[PDB]
């Protein structure tokens, strides 16, 4: 007996060779392979396969190769591939990607993916499943920002802040031992993974280093604290010793140096360059040249993503009003004009497409949107396909190459940069079960279910008073993973090795899972999945025009984007 491919896709989700449109973009992903055995697909429900004696094994105890949770029939979109598999979770980790069920009666069952008495089921047929997003440019300003991030499929927030204090409103910094301790405590109640950055400023080692020992997961160098050669140098010396990452927002004003001076201070050491295009901050006008260097891990923040007709007017005004600049003061106008540049924003779209900027991030509440990292990644990929065509590397008329390049920017690459990719950032065996299910129609717009540590934390779901869960109003809501003590087991506080060795968790009474930051100092651009390109970026000081390999990088702004007015009530 045979099933036509339309009916098959409707029942089990798509299989090899089938394509799926990402939301309302022009982007199509194609199933590269499928781990199933046709006819032995797992599924759950009345008269379905995962029943005792059948696709559910009735013999084995939980320890004996049995899963806590099976996601059936997932279409995985990950740097590692775009493919169809069951995903098996146990102890809050992904233990098996393959084919789940019961070896009693089914062929091709992955040996550690037995559905047994202890197994919960999530139907992922017809869904796209990705890793949870890793946002490494978070200002901790307003706790309401967390649900915003969860609703767009973000599961890890790295950054800093003490709430809406001016320091925190400008910079991703939790300064000093006491503020870091306080925010580690606060973190116990935030249903998302967290890592905290200390202040990457000082001219003696001890004031900087004591923040790492106190529990910081990294450092932020910010011009508002003085992005001087000395602050850059000491931060990196601390980071080399402590094995944590340093993010930089460089000296826009060129006050103590130009870009070349910042690069000299860095002296070949590894650094994460934030909003590398420069609208969000950095050496005017040539900061984006950072993204050509092998020791630089470059990220964009999201408001320039992608280049649209409203972008420039929005940014000029934003800059002026947020720095209290006057329109009648020529120095203010000159500064604004030197910082907000169509030439660099347009080139930023293309640098993403070429794999030269490796990472996306929000800049949540300082100059970026907490819930639009994933959204804008795909809008950018879509714009680039429209303007530049399918990339050379594509085949079968799919956008798989571009989709892997782009998904990498907000999943694996930030995880690698931060030193946390042993735990998070991709759907791979042995990593924490931070998983986002998406209806393809809502892909990159509104997550269906966000799984944190193997338990749903956040879901678009309806009337809690109804007979069934789908009646209106369907809205984003915190689920059981966020409630009571379960918030401790489903989320990770990422911390420096030294703070962990020094017993900071026990000292502060932290109950969350503790993740170790490590392997941050001997990576480079070459380690950024699908985004590993180094090149000489030239930025013309007069015209601001960006060149790579002798060619000007320019594109037009678009009047309209997908993943916009079709979806949003405001």
């Amino acid at each position: 007996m045979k099933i036509n491919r339309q009916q098959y896709a409707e029942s089990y989700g798509p299989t090899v060779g089938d394509q799926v449109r990402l939301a309302d973009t022009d982007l199509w992903i194609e199933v590269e392979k499928d781990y199933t055995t046709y006819g032995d697909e797992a599924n759950f429900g009345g008269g379905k396969v995962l029943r005792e004696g059948m696709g559910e094994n009735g013999t084995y105890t939980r320890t004996e190769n049995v899963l806590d949770l099976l996601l059936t029939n997932a279409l995985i979109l990950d740097y590692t591939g775009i493919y169809k598999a069951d995903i098996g979770v146990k102890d809050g980790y992904i233990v098996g990607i393959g084919k789940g069920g019961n070896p009693d009666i089914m062929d091709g069952v992955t040996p550690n993916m037995i559905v047994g008495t202890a197994t919960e089921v999530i139907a992922a047929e017809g869904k796209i499943v990705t890793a949870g997003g890793i946002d490494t440019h978070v200002h901790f300003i307003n706790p309401d920002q967390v649900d915003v991030a969860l609703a767009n499929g973000i599961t890890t927030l790295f950054g800093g802040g003490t709430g809406p204090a001016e320091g925190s409103k400008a910079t991703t910094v939790t300064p000093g031992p006491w503020n870091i301790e306080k925010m580690l405590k606060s973190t116990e109640g935030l249903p998302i993974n967290v890592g905290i950055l200390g202040k990457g400023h000082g001219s003696s080692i001890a004031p900087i280093m004591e923040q790492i020992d106190a529990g910081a997961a990294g450092l932020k160098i910010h011009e508002d604290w003085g992005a001087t050669p000395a602050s850059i140098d000491r931060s990196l010396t601390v980071a080399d010793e402590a094995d944590v990452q340093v993010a930089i927002h460089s000296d826009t004003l060129n006050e103590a140096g130009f870009l070349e001076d910042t690069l000299r201070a860095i002296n070949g050491r590894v650094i994460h360059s934030f909003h590398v295009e420069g609208a969000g901050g950095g050496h005017a006008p040539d900061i984006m040249a950072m993204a050509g260097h092998p020791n630089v891990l470059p990220s964009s923040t999201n408001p320039t993503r992608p280049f649209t007709v409203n972008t420039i007017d929005e940014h000029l005004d934003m800059l002026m009003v947020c720095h209290h600049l006057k329109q009648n003061i020529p120095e203010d106008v000159a500064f604004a004009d030197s910082r907000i540049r169509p030439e660099t924003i347009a080139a930023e779209d293309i640098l993403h497409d070429l794999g030269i900027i490796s990472m996306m991030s929000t800049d949540a509440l300082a100059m970026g949107r907490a819930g639009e990292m994933v959204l804008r990644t795909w809008q950018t990929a879509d714009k680039m396909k429209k303007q530049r065509g399918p990339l050379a590397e594509e085949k079968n008329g799919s956008d798989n190459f571009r989709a892997k390049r782009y998904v990498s920017k907000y999943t694996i690459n930030p995880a690698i940069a931060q030193g946390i990719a042993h735990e998070v950032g991709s759907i791979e065996e042995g990593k924490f079960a931070d998983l986002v299910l998406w209806e393809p129609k809502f892909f990159g717009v509104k997550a269906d279910r966000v799984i944190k540590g193997g338990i749903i934390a956040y879901a678009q779901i309806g009337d809690p008073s109804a007979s069934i869960p789908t009646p209106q109003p369907v809205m984003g809501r915190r689920m059981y993973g966020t409630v009571g003590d379960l918030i401790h087991d489903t989320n990770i506080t990422f911390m420096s090795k030294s703070s962990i060795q020094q017993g900071v968790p026990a000292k502060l009474g932290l109950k969350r899972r503790i993740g170790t930051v490590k392997n941050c100092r001997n990576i480079g651009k070459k380690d950024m999945k699908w985004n590993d390109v180094t090149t000489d970026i030239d930025i013309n000081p007069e015209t601001y025009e960006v060149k790579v390999d002798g060619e000007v990088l320019t594109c037009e702004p678009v009047k309209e984007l997908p993943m916009a007015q079709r979806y949003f009530l405001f």
Partner: protein, 122 residues
């Protein structure tokens, strides 16, 4: 008697900044091709290498402008600025690592500035 909620009625007079400190005017040129903006409280000798001026005249000093404001030099622009004396202990650490101690060590600051190519060591 129109009420502006929370309005100020400031007293008469003017606030003199940096009162009783020595002032010094010098010419400074941005020899670079990118703009340079200098804040009120950066040790003046430690600014961007590409600013050309008599580096010795920046030692122990900063711009005599209101706290939190900055002087802007467009590419190629030369202009006069007024400096005032640093106060407190008159020590500077960090920034460009030219001082790292008393501002009185003129010889040592200038030697460092010269070795690192800070323009205008005379």
């Amino acid at each position: 008697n129109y009420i502006v909620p929370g309005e100020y009625r400031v007293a008469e007079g003017e606030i003199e900044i940096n009162a009783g400190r020595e002032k010094t005017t010098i010419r400074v040129s941005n020899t670079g091709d990118r703009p340079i903006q200098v804040g009120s409280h950066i040790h003046f000798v430690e600014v961007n290498k590409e600013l050309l001026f008599d580096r010795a005249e920046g030692i122990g000093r900063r711009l005599n402008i209101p706290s939190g404001t900055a002087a802007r030099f467009e590419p190629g622009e030369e202009m006069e600025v007024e400096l005032t004396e640093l106060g407190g202990n008159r020590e500077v650490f960090g920034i460009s690592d030219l001082t790292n101690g008393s501002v009185d060590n003129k010889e040592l600051i200038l030697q460092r500035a010269k070795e690192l190519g800070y323009k205008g060591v005379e």
